[PDB]
Symmetry: C3
Subunit: 332 residues, 3 copies
């Protein structure tokens, strides 16, 4: 009887940060209560000042990472305020039935709904909006995120030994398809209905105009760079709701990688680059061994360095000259 | 001596259905005899009525799924009737030597040939036409299918326990590259020779105009939706002869997935989405747990919902409110 | 103390050949000394005579395959002669720290540098040039290669038994993005600075104009076809620094495949086609069973047969009619 289970309310945080949770379950199964509010808003996505009408869960692209344990129940209250103009819903790849919840969560502006589902499979999973007849538009406008369902005894390596992370970050990679005129400049629109056929035409090229981490070119750089220290074990969760991506930590590795994100499978070891299929979330564990700046990129380098799919880690600590050294510094 | 083996003639069926076979081999190795007749025909591939000149094995896109056991011999009689205009052949990725049989099966219109090969590796494998100098044209005009070579003791899970399916479906995903004029309308042609350079130019964009299951937008929907019942174990074989695809069952999972299709490898567990590389067939096993409509899609959602790469399952049975429930239905 | 280790100087060879090495380490850890000289040069990449300004390590696209054992130290002397015009550096995906060495190896023309790093993870790894603000231009102009770090006890199969290769080849697959005018003809340029914005614009299409093995259409064909004999165990290392590829040996298989190239993981068995993500190197082991010509291709067949991503193996020996035979040769 689900009514006899403990309930716990989670307060979500903005990516790339992740709400507090326990890796190993410290309670029995619980109903884990989340609330998200849909926000349609203008977002500046690049250095040129290109501004799109984003569709978001909780004001961010991506939506927040939700974290539960296997065989918990996830209960989501989804709010569509009357300040929005569109119908939205939510589909969880973690859930079973009703198009992942999409069939049960259609909310017009001024409506709310509450969905409960049992998290029966451990892994990281995409969630996204999926309104009938409009699915790729919503998803490619930013309306996606991920949920992590941890095994009750936490993560394990290929030999079944515990893998415990010290820090976790969530990188949502978003492909935008900003409509272009024939000269190649981005077009702007006065209503969603007036933008829609042009959105569809831009999507049908299959060529994103921008591919960004955390919602904008340069979002995970500067004062918003990811951080770690030498010796820290970091889990990076990475999702892409629509298009394949190939994450790579420049100067590092994926020590243990679940490229398709499902923790019942043994991880791949020592990866340089891993492929996360469109519509999947993956997770990579790394222990930093050197200080300095790392670039975390989609290793289609055009996507990384021309279209925006790159962020930085700033790592503190001691340099290890055994692992790498300049023997002769650049000279004539 | 192959002449001392039993011979069994198979009568093929139209995808997404699969000819009758045994999962566990009930005989010793056999020569399994198949016949396919090449048919060049006009096919309407979308709701707008876009009509292409398809090149098919046995009148269908994809070609039929052939099913044998490891170390059977496959004997194929390939017929190119004099009503066709082109040279064709057949390459099996399951076979060893002679470009998969392609070098030995070149048939002009009015010719036939018979190829025999030993199915030495268990898995699902693409087959396709591959005439010298014209390969991608034939393949992207529909001339591809798959063959499943089952282990003699049937499929096994990651622990080596039997996995037995109740139903099997074959989804062939086809990328078409319909030539477009500068305004973006599809062009039409009076002969294959007159279409060819325009075909090549359209292929060189690397951007399909259509991506469809079972040969047309909406082919696996409505009265042609895939079916199952709650509790049924279903194997979905999915092939793509030219381009990567990322299947996803909306509302379900791949309980056991061989994303690159080869059964000597342990399956990946609990997949949301899996990547099948171009030129590969993969196979996903799922036990349905909820009734209703599921969408089976390529999870590039643009490819799914704008370009045609989506089908439906209709699943009968009892709803499980423990797994998913609406707690508060959408309301003001 | 690294000064007490043996030093061994390697003389590199042109791809697809690989310098001589031992599969099983016959010495303790060593400092393995390599020298590469950067060469900017004009290269004819297709049958039409399209000529690009290539940027190379050691005069070749790809750069040479370096081969060391796990926990060796790699010491590279990188030379940028004053005959070149650009700044270059080198990033090794095998290395840990300083952006894979990129931060420590920036060499102006007329400069050289020496980097040492410990090869701590066994696998095949990409290396490439990565100058700040210009990364995809250098990489997509040919400035990439791979390094193989073998386990000290050589390669092993999925059961931990030795896999020993008789021959090894390195296939570098390169995506070029040759700028096109509006009519679609390739443009030509009088300086790198004058080409750069057009390079960027061509890259931003995400649609390569050429995809080639060993630096040009047809490079691994004819007198430069790869060779083997029936019964020979061949390892093919394949890298792609920027874009996903899906290798396939037409008429063969990948008996044992490390699609993401890392030897601590068990190989995938019996692959028809495998996906190597952009920014990764993979390795496939095959024992030839039939003589004749094989085509080794990217199984996006458009990329293979229209854009250049295809090479040949010529295999000597005895035909096995048990594995494949023409029963009835093509006839009326
Ligand atoms: O085929 N693009 O996901
Ligand atoms: O690179 N397309 O398969
Ligand atoms: O998304 N191309 O690597
Ligand atoms: Cu929405
Ligand atoms: Cu989805
Ligand atoms: Cu054909
Ligand atoms: Cu093929
Ligand atoms: Cu360079
Ligand atoms: Cu790199």
């Amino acid at each position: 009887d689900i009514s006899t289970l403990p309930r716990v309310k989670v307060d979500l945080v903005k990516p790339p940060f992740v709400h507090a949770h326990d890796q190993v379950a410290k309670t029995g199964p619980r109903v884990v209560e989340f609330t998200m509010t849909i926000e349609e808003k203008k977002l500046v996505i690049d250095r040129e000042g290109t501004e799109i009408h984003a569709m978001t869960f909780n004001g961010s692209v991506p939506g927040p990472l939700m974290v539960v344990h296997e065989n918990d129940y996830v209960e989501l209250r989804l709010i569509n305020p009357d300040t929005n103009t569109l119908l939205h819903n939510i589909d969880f790849h973690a859930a079973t039935g009703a198009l992942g919840g999409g069939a049960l969560t259609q909310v017009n502006p001024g409506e709310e709904t509450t969905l409960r589902f049992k998290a029966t499979k451990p892994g990281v999973f995409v969630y996204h909006c999926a309104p009938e007849g409009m699915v790729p538009w919503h998803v490619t406008s930013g309306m996606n995120g991920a949920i992590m369902v941890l095994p009750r005894d936490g993560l394990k390596d290929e030999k079944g030994q515990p893998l415990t992370y010290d820090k976790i970050y969530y990188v949502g990679e978003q492909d935008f398809y900003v409509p272009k005129d024939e000269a190649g400049n981005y077009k702007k629109y006065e209503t969603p209905g007036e933008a829609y056929e042009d959105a569809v035409k831009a999507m049908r090229t299959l060529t994103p105009t921008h591919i960004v981490f955390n919602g904008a070119v340069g979002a995970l750089t500067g004062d918003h760079a990811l951080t770690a220290a030498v010796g820290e074990r970091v889990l990076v969760v990475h999702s892409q709701a629509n298009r394949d991506t190939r994450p790579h930590l420049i100067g590092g590795h994926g020590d243990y990688v679940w490229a398709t994100g499902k923790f019942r499978n043994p991880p791949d070891l020592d990866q340089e680059t891993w492929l996360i299929p469109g519509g999947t979330a993956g997770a990579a564990f790394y222990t930093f061994r050197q200080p300095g700046v790392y670039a975390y990129v989609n290793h289609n380098l055009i996507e990384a360095f021309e279209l925006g799919a790159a962020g930085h880690f700033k790592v503190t600590g001691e340099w290890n000259d055994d692992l790498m050294t300049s023997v002769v510094k650049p000279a004539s």
